[PDB]
Amino acid sequence: TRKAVIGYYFIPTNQINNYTETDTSVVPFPVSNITPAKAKQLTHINFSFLDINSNLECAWDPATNDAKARDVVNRLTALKAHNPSLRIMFSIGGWYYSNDLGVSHANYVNAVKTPASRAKFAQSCVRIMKDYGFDGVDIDWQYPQAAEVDGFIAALQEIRTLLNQQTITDGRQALPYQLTIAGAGGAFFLSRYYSKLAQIVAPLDYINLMTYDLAGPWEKVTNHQAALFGDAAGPTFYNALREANLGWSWEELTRAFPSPFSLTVDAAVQQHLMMEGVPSAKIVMGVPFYGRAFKGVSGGNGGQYSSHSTPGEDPYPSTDYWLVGCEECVRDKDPRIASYRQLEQMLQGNYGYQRLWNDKTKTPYLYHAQNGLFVTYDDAESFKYKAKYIKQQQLGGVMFWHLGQDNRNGDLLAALDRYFNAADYDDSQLDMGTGLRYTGVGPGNLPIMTAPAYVPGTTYAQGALVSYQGYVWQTKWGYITSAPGSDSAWLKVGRV
Numbered sequence: 104t105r106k107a108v109i110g111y112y113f114i115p116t117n118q119i120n121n122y123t124e125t126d127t128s129v130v131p132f133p134v135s136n137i138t139p140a141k142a143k144q145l146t147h148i149n150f151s152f153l154d155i156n157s158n159l160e161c162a163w164d165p166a167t168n169d170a171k172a173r174d175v176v177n178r179l180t181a182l183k184a185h186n187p188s189l190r191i192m193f194s195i196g197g198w199y200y201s202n203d204l205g206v207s208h209a210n211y212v213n214a215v216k217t218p219a220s221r222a223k224f225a226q227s228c229v230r231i232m233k234d235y236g237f238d239g240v241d242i243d244w245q246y247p248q249a250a251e252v253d254g255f256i257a258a259l260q261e262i263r264t265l266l267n268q269q270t271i272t273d274g275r276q277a278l279p280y281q282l283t284i285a286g287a288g289g290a291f292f293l294s295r296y297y298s299k300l301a302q303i304v305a306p307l308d309y310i311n312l313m314t315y316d317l318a319g320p321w322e323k324v325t326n327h328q329a330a331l332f333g334d335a336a337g338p339t340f341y342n343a344l345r346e347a348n349l350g351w352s353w354e355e356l357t358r359a360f361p362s363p364f365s366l367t368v369d370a371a372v373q374q375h376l377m378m379e380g381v382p383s384a385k386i387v388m389g390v391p392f393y394g395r396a397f398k399g400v401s402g403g404n405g406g407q408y409s410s411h412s413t414p415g416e417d418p419y420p421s422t423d424y425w426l427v428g429c430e431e432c433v434r435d436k437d438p439r440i441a442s443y444r445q446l447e448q449m450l451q452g453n454y455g456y457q458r459l460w461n462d463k464t465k466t467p468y469l470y471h472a473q474n475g476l477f478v479t480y481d482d483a484e485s486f487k488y489k490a491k492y493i494k495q496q497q498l499g500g501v502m503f504w505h506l507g508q509d510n511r512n513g514d515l516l517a518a519l520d521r522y523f524n525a526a527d528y529d530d531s532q533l534d535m536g537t538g539l540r541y542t543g544v545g546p547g548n549l550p551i552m553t554a555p556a557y558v559p560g561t562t563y564a565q566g567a568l569v570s571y572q573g574y575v576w577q578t579k580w581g582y583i584t585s586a587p588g589s590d591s592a593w594l595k596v597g598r599v
């Protein structure tokens with residue numbers, strides 16, 4: 104089954120409002136950049152972002168010029184003419200609107216509180232989708248808190264129902280309306296709703312893991328923002344998941360959540376697979392189309408794992424644009440972020456950057472010896488490993504933030520498409536390396552194994568193995584006369 108290639112596409116409100124396909128100083132990446140060939144490399148385009156207003160319904164930003172919005176959306180859905188499998192989805196939320204301190208945060212909390220608020224919010228989603236011509240809904244709330252999860256779950260089940268009804272009413276069985284969400288890609292915030300992952304994923308076609316931003320100015324040691332696998336020399340983190348209200352036993356929590364651990368794309372994907380009820384096919388691995396820059400680093404390991412003096416304030420608080428050769432950083436006023444389109448130009452402008460490669464994490468990085476700078480980003484090369492990882496783990500596909508940041512020839516999107524579908528590309532010999540793998544194992548991804556059926560009346564010694572309820576169980580100590588699961592002495596260690 105074809106791997107999803109989900110491109111979020113962000114156009115700030117004032118760009119909609121001054122939209123033009125002829126002046127990059129105003130709209131850097133207009134829809135015209137997406138040629139028929141590019142439309143064919145995508146399966147989904149997630150227009151970003153819509154919000155949840157004070158009336159607790161899905162709606163465009165208050166300051167949006169509706170005529171221009173519809174014109175831009177129409178330009179996107181017109182791309183469907185070149186690829187019959189393409190879906191233009193819209194995403195609700197995003198960092199700016201929904202974080203704990205976001206401008207619309209309370210609307211998200213309220214929208215999901217009661218059956219009526221949920222019914223009202225859900226219907227507003229379907230109305231917006233039909234009214235503008237979208238093909239599905241992506242919920243990007245970062246992130247409901249533990250108490251808000253049950254309501255959030257109910258709002259998703261409500262949107263699924265309305266959407267499924269709409270697919271029937273519109274004869275869209277050839278391309279059903281879809282529902283997806285963007286999920287945390289790191290243990291830290293994933294722990295808010297982790298215990299109820301199965302219920303959260305059930306109503307979705309995909310869960311887009313934001314497996315990027317794993318590093319940033321908020322961490323004392325510079326690091327790759329999307330390491331595929333871990334590097335023993337890099338930092339490690341407390342496995343917050345071991346504290347989730349899972350109801351598991353110490354042995355289960357320990358085998359499932361080693362701590363500390365390496366914060367990697369691999370860790371997030373495995374953490375999701377460990378949950379019963381979360382099918383690999385619904386998991387989509389996000390990759391970033393931009394890099395993160397740190398200053399005040401020390402040479403030695405090319406800027407990696409070093410202390411730094413990068414401001415963490417959001418937005419950036421200064422006019423000191425220290426990313427050498429980064430024009431894009433000046434107009435957007437932040438030297439800490441740079442689109443891959445710009446990073447590429449920085450590399451060919453003799454600005455003093457050296458491109459390095461970490462064969463453990465399988466990701467590139469820039470180092471500027473003269474000014475002490477370090478940049479972590481992804482490229483066509485790191486995408487090879489991630490694409491193979493996706494195929495190997497049988498994931499749903501890849502997702503990226505965001506289309507508007509690729510170079511003009513669209514090499515990043517092209518590489519992704521190439522690795523999944525080009526008949527002249529073969530990665531059977533691509534060596535995935537020795538970087539650290541997340542070794543956790545849980546209920547949803549136990550090893551297949553065999554054992555003598557459990558025999559009632561039998562006394563089992565320590566470490567004994569038996570089959571029961573379609574699982575293989577192992578005793579934790581001796582003289583076990585109880586049945587598996589029917590006593591704290593047995594550890595479920597395998598399936599079938």
Ligand SMILES: CC(=O)N[C@@H]1[C@@H](O)[C@H](O[C@@H]2O[C@H](CO)[C@@H](O[C@@H]3O[C@H](CO)[C@@H](O[C@@H]4O[C@H](CO)[C@@H](O[C@@H]5O[C@H](CO)[C@@H](O)[C@H](O)[C@H]5NC(C)=O)[C@H](O)[C@H]4NC(C)=O)[C@H](O)[C@H]3NC(C)=O)[C@H](O)[C@H]2NC(C)=O)[C@@H](CO)O[C@H]1O
Pocket residue numbers: 111152196197198199200243245285287288289290291292313315316317319321322393417440504
């Ligand atoms: C005080 C302290 O040190 N606490 C830390 C704690 O901060 C650490 O957790 C990390 O927190 C940071 C925020 O402080 C998290 O950074 C988030 O990460 C989000 C993804 O998980 C990210 O949002 C998504 O990613 C896109 C790219 O960043 C977002 O794009 C942005 O959209 C804006 C409009 O909404 C637009 O204005 C911006 O220009 C745009 N940015 C870019 C690069 O284009 C997108 O909105 C969003 N959705 C999707 C689908 O991609 C946030 O942007 C980002 N915030 C900021 C300000 O950068 C980080 O993820 C947390 N880490 C982890 C592992 O969860 C914590 C652990 O490190 O330690 C504490 O001590």
